Structure 1
Amino acid sequence: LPNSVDWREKDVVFPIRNQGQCGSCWTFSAVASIETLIGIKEDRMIALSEQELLDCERTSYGCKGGYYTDAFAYVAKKGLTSREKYPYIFQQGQCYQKEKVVKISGYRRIPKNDEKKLQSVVAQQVVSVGVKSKSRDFQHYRSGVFSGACGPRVDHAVNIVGYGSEGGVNYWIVRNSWGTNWGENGYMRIPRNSNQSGGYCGIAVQAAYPVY
């Protein structure tokens, strides 16, 4: 495996987005993983609709949380339209089935706590993960390899877009949907192979990724 991976430098990751208040992080995480997968497999960068998932994915809770795994299943069964055709309106609305621009074939779930298998997959694509976000340290993070306190429970869907090392401290590169004023232009470097079981802030507890 490569010592370092950063899909942002590979022309397959769109700019950081902002979910606002709506608990639609799961739609952002699912969309981010699919967008990059389509970029890797087809060399096509097409911005996809979080709003369709929020409005139309029936296992989730709209602005009160949801499942990127089931979002993958939805895209595999029904396809997904573009962000231009169906933009994000910061709240759940009427479910529209517009012209779809992409499918996937399925998804896979990574075993709990297996950062080694996680690294294997991150070296090939972007992965959807959940983190324990509900803490002052996590919300107020600005720069560096995060060393602060996590929330009590996994409650926030994000993505891993790469991995690397600074001063011999291994980290994952985490894409969030809180806009660019959070962290390092919207991203966080979180310890990799850390001493927290489930990964730092639970990042390895429930990882999943789309299959083209």
Structure 2
Amino acid sequence: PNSVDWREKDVVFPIRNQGQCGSCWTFSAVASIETLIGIKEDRMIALSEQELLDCERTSYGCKGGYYTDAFAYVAKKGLTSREKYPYIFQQGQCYQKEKVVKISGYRRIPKNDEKKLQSVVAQQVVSVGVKSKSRDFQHYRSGVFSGACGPRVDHAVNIVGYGSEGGVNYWIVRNSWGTNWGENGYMRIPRNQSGGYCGIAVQAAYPVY
């Protein structure tokens, strides 16, 4: 497809806010799973970032984590709904409540491969990491981003589609900083920097239904 936008396909929930807690990895994992379930089952169910934050044991709570291992947790343990286990903006006791969704596994996209990244984005939402520690990235408002990136991949986000404006290819990037950041919470990042713009293609991964 020349363009993809899952937000226009009834499978992407509204932008959320992680607050200060470094739980971006939980928001990225949840967003990828939420859309996958919407694609595969035609069912919209909001899932719990809080369960991953409190219960996923390879990660660092509010100091960062792994959406890849979050996928493995969901495949192995299931995941409850956001209604049952809401986000409290900090890590708490790990509750194992009634689960609403599983996955079968997850796959990693080889580093720097935007062609394979695009092929997967054409089918579902993908979890990625970007270099967010920069004034330009934090204060991005609109347009296809052409500012400076952070020094290192440090912020887990999602790619929810792709397109073009004026011949400029872009990825549609879902962040968890609320709707006041970027284009109502999203960023259009150049598509096709080695590793992708702000390293978007360095560590891409996606859940397998």
What per-residue deviation string (whole Å, max 9, x for no partner) do you get for residues 34-63 of structure 1?
000000000000000000000000000000
Alignment identity in percent? 100
Structure 2 residue runs without a partner (length 5+): none
SS in structure 2 of the partner of residue 96 of structure 1? coil
Distance 2:4 2:25 in 1: 23
User: Quick one: distance in 2 between partners of 1:53 and 1:69?
Assistant: 12
Task: Give how far 1:178 is off.
Answer: 0.1
How far does residue 177 in structure 1 lie from its aligned partner after superposition? 0.1
Q: Distance in 2 between matches of 1:181 and 1:59?
A: 31
SS in 2 for 1:171: strand
Stretches of structure 1 that go unaligned for 5 or more consecutive residues are: none
When the two structures are superposed, what TM-score results if normalisation uses the length of structure 2?
1.00
Shift of residue 130, structure 1, vs aligned partner = 0.0
Shift of 1:181: 0.1
Q: Under a length normalisation based on structure 1, what TM-score does the superposition of the two structures give?
A: 0.98
The match for 2:195 is: 198
CA distance in 2, matches of 1:63, 1:4: 35
Distance in 1 separating the partners of 2:142 and 2:116: 27
C-alpha distance in 2 between matches for 1:116 and 1:21 = 34
CA offset digits 1:95-119 (Å, max 9, x no partner): 0000000000000000000000000
Partners of 2:204 and 2:195 lie apart in 1 by 10
C-alpha root-mean-square deviation of aligned residues, in Å?
A: 0.5
Residues of 1 paired with 2:44 and 2:147: CA distance?
35
Where 1:170 maps in the other structure, the secondary structure is: strand
CA distance in structure 1 between the aligned counterparts of 2:42 and 2:21, rounded to whole angstroms = 31
Q: Measure the CA separation in 2 of the matches of 1:64 and 1:153.
A: 15
| Matched pairs, number | 209
